[PDB]
Amino acid sequence: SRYDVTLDQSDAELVEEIAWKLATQATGRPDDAEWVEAARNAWHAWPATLRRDLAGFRRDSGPDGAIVLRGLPVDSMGLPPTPRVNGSVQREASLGAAVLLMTACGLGDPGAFLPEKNGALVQDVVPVPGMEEFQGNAGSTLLTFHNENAFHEHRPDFVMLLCLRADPTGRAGLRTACVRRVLPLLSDSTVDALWAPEFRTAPPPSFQAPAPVLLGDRSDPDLRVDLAATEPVTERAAEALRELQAHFDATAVTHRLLPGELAIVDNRVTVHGRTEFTPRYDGTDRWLQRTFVLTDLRRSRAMRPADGYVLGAAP
Ligand code: NA
């Protein structure tokens, strides 16, 4: 499958060399524009095979709206214990930051939101004691299906998750479900409901009108939904969300990520969630790093002071 790519040894070694050079030699640190520039330049040193694979995915993300790359460099011997604080981010140069920011610059540009993880471009996904029930990075209860930052006009176009350390307990898996798999299975009444402006997705409290869930083309729509946050404004809308959830559940691909695996989710067409797990809280738990990609950074300029990578309020 061209949506499941394992790097061959030659390509894996080259990307490792490139990532280490960026991580150790580039001036500044990942959130600095000069480091993102070094990452952009380093991306273009990647093997053509992988650049072609990513370009193909950007053009058409396929029936599941997701790709996984396996065999990317991660510093397993050098990895510290899994962080255990909420809001954990990667401010220092590292191999994980190098891989994520290079790939972001290949697909578009990286971006982040000031009210979420303090606008860091590379964010940790790690379980935190006391946050078990949270619908977010720090939680370990079932994470309900959603588009990332569904409320936001400039929500991520892609969400990238690089696995540093697998969940040792075997119960955690990333779940992705694409509107392309479910649209043909939905009832006419549900489809009609999802095109109507009868859903309210209010911003989270940290970020300080009724609209449709389905967007764009009738046969190949985008979608905008968060099954935790999106509120139906009518009864048919409520029924539509229940049917949509059911079909997401039935058609979702579930992935237990392993070190060196990079999952890239097309957030225009694919929702994601996560199964429940019981953290150990002993430094050995699941550790992903996450970076958002904007396919056209220019569109959010009004929200990006100094033409930076951190989106805040407009106008
Ligand atoms: Na998410």
Q: List binding-site positions.
A: 116, 137, 146, 148-149, 272, 286, 290
How many CB atoms are located within 10 Å of the residue 99 CB? 28
Determine the distance separating the centroid of ligand 1 and the alpha carbon of 61, expressed in angstroms: 18
Determine the distance separating the centroid of ligand 1 and the alpha carbon of 165, expressed in angstroms: 18
How many CB atoms are located within 10 Å of the residue 242 CB? 12
Experimental method: X-ray
| CA 168/CA 155 separation, integer angstroms | 31
Q: Write out the two tokens for 274.
A: 């996560």
Determine the distance separating the centroid of ligand 1 and the alpha carbon of 127, expressed in angstroms: 14
Q: List binding-site positions for Fe cation.
A: 146, 148, 272
| CA 171/CA 61 separation, integer angstroms | 27
Looking at residue 196, which CATH number applies to its domain?
Answer: 3.60.130.10
Q: List binding-site positions for 2-oxoglutarate.
A: 286
Determine the distance separating the centroid of ligand 1 and the alpha carbon of 269, expressed in angstroms: 14
Are 239 and 247 a contacting pair, CB within 8 Å?
Answer: no
Q: List binding-site positions for L-asparagine.
A: 116, 137, 148-149, 290
| CA 208/CA 224 separation, integer angstroms | 21
Determine the distance separating the centroid of ligand 1 and the alpha carbon of 27, expressed in angstroms: 31
Determine the distance separating the centroid of ligand 1 and the alpha carbon of 43, expressed in angstroms: 25
Number of folded domains that form the chain: 1
Domain of residue 147, residue span: 1-315
